[PDB]
Ligand binder design. Structure first.
Ligand SMILES: CCCCCCCCCCCCO[C@H]1O[C@H](CO)[C@@H](O[C@H]2O[C@H](CO)[C@@H](O)[C@H](O)[C@H]2O)[C@H](O)[C@H]1O
Ligand SMILES: CC1(C)CCC(C)(C)c2cc([C@@H](O)c3ccc4cc(C(=O)O)ccc4c3)ccc21
Length: 235
């Protein structure tokens, strides 16, 4: 129990230090392609993809702060990151949804409306991702819960090509314990919150599968290759 409390603190801090809260960011906007959907606005794609690269680096930094992660083989660290990074990216941007303005906010404060999210690359996946974001809201997750859920998504022993999947399973166990303890303590009158959170992982995987499908069509629409850390994620 003391060790589980320290794990909660450590994961919470790692998330906050690699992912600013919506409340913390100085929002700004752009007038690019703001009023009508187009196939792709290349200036918005260039900015979006740069922000995605930076957030991948942050997710790697977060991962290496999770207790035990750097005790895994470097190969298994890389396999886990490749398998989960798009899931965690999708979760992160959906936690930055402002329903009253129908916007999402990136880590530099860039705040895009739904049409701009579409035009920056989401394309035909846009409205389904905004609906996922919308349905995250009733859970009223806090940053500790988002951090723990992200860790659970990453540290999962079912990933293909792991060398030591039983070791990965054993690292996930206290994360699961920690999220249930935390979630029930915070909202004892809503005991379905922990299972609802875990079922969001399945939803995220479905959105990330659709995002990988979108990457294939977007590749045809952009003049050069995607950024190298994005290509790492997609392989
Ligand atoms: C998901 C697919 C990826 C598979 C795993 C491979 C990802 C490899 C990531 C290792 C990154 C090495 O990191 C090394 O260079 C980064 C980029 O100059 C630095 O990154 C640094 O600058 C960034 C600015 O973009 C900051 O946001 C980081 O917080 C900061 O630490 C690191 O501090 C340094 O340790
Ligand atoms: C694979 C690829 C390139 C193409 C296909 C689509 C458009 C589906 C896509 C969507 C994302 C998207 O989840 C995303 C992007 C930037 C993000 C930036 C931040 C941040 O600033 O803190 C946080 C979350 C983010 C989340 C990432 C890559 C991709």
């Amino acid at each position: 129990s003391p060790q589980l409390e320290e794990l909660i603190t450590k994961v919470s801090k790692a998330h906050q230090e690699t992912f600013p809260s919506l409340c913390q960011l100085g929002k700004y906007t752009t007038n690019s392609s703001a009023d009508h959907r187009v196939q792709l606005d290349l200036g918005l794609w260039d900015k979006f993809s740069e922000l995605a690269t930076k957030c991948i680096i942050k997710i790697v930094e977060f991962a290496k702060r999770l207790p035990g992660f750097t005790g895994l083989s470097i190969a298994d660290q890389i396999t886990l990151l490749k398998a989960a990074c798009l899931d965690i990216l999708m979760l992160r941007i959906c936690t930055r949804y402002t329903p009253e303005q129908d916007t999402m906010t990136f880590s530099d404060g860039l705040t895009l409306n739904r049409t701009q999210m579409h035009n920056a690359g989401f394309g035909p996946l846009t409205d389904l991702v905004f609906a996922f974001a919308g349905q995250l809201l009733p859970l009223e997750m806090d940053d500790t819960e988002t951090g723990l859920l992200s860790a659970i998504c990453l540290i999962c022993g079912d990933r293909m090509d792991l060398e030591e999947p039983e070791k990965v399973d054993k690292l996930q166990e206290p994360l699961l314990e920690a999220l249930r303890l935390y979630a029930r303590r915070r909202r004892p009158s809503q005991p379905y919150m922990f299972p609802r959170m875990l079922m969001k992982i399945t939803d995220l995987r479905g959105i990330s599968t659709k995002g990988a499908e979108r990457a294939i069509t977007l590749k045809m629409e952009i003049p050069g290759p995607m950024p190298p850390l994005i290509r790492e994620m997609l392989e």
